[PDB]
């Protein structure tokens, strides 16, 4: 583990990021104690309060837990929804021990076409949200997502929606659960503009994910197309044989 004191990136943030890597490395195993706050302080020659800030942040994110008078430990993850269910990008990143975020690239409220109407099974003519975001994990681009949503199913949208979970909004606005999705996966090569935004070379491996998601209603509320970085993302799921 390596701290660079002269870097613009705050010491505490350097520590969080590396500890997060050590957890996915398996250098820090679940339910196993972490070095003490003073040990870390001594091992890097830093303030104990900076260590506290890092550790405390990871506890508050649910990545670590603390037992009063007995230290800090790695938390067991929550995997039912990730492997056996359907996750939003936000839940997906958390299942992987990553911190999700989003930055808006483009927002348009567009007129329905027969093609989009067919896919969403919405009204034509009508209004459809078109939301283009960079999805981040640990402040680093992970995907570019273009998302179409019937206006009636989401109402008026703004920056506060774009920077959090759209799935959470949908369920609260409609007071109906999300129930299922059709998804298609295709491999591809990053275009110049996808590559530049994503932080990878032109032509680098990329996963194209097309998803239509449904309310318990049977009503489609979203059709989305995403490009995920190949170096950082693999898709994982269980399948059951029907009989």
């Amino acid at each position: 583990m390596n701290i660079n004191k002269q870097s613009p990136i705050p010491i505490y943030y350097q520590i969080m990021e590396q500890l997060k890597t050590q957890i996915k490395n398996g250098e820090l195993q679940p339910d196993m104690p972490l070095p003490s706050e003073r040990e870390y302080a001594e091992q890097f020659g830093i303030s104990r309060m900076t260590v506290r800030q890092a550790l405390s942040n990871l506890v508050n994110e649910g990545l670590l837990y603390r037992l009063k008078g007995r230290g800090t430990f790695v938390s067991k993850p929550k995997m039912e929804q990730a492997l056996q269910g359907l996750t939003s990008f936000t839940e997906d990143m958390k299942s992987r021990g990553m911190t999700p975020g989003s930055r808006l690239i483009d927002y348009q409220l567009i007129d329905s076409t027969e093609e989009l109407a067919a896919i969403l099974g919405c009204g034509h003519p009508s209004s459809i949200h078109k939301i283009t975001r960079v999805r981040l994990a640990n402040d680093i681009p992970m995907a570019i997502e273009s998302s179409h949503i019937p206006f009636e199913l989401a109402g008026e949208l703004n920056e506060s929606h774009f920077q959090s979970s759209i799935y959470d909004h949908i369920e609260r606005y409609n007071s109906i659960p999300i129930s299922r999705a059709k998804q298609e996966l295709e491999p591809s090569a990053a275009t110049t503009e996808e590559a530049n935004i994503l932080g990878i070379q032109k032509g680098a491996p990329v996963l194209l994910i097309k998803r239509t998601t449904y309310l318990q209603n049977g009503t489609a509320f979203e059709h989305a197309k995403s490009v995920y970085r190949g170096d950082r993302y693999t898709f994982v799921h269980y399948m059951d044989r029907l009989s």
Copy 2:
């Protein structure tokens, strides 16, 4: 549809494949009648028996059905298992209206390794089948598959097994149904060897698929790694929110 009579590819084969294309894009709709032998015969300027040969082979593959007379209808394929369950390559290709095939690249009976023991949950030391095939759809390379299978769960394997469905053999051999799989998918670029065998350019998009498959009783019988042509293959599946 066009027909090249001077081609080494048999006419009835050229017909089969262009009818398959018509279906795959909905120029022929499910459960809608096709033209008769005479109409096709006249269309291409060929024997009626050649058209019949193309249609009858398609009936046998379940791509078409009959009801009465030689007259033929587009089949409406079962998609439930493909989209919501778990299919072998064989069933997967059929759900797409493609004809699956297999050719052996390599076979070895290998000794158990620590990593492989932990994956399949099998014994160590033990013997493991290592089977590398080119998986074909309509006589054209689709995937390269490398699968590890504990000897005891398959017994002795030969060409008759490799050129057919492993999944079916393992169910017949064991009298226990296949239950579930864990799959991981990652995009990549074809190596030189992979690209050559697949019929694509070096560095062309491929999909890496890693699958561990279990029997109804919980035993893992297969750990497979595959490379799929990005130009022919899309992965499709429904997911339910818990």
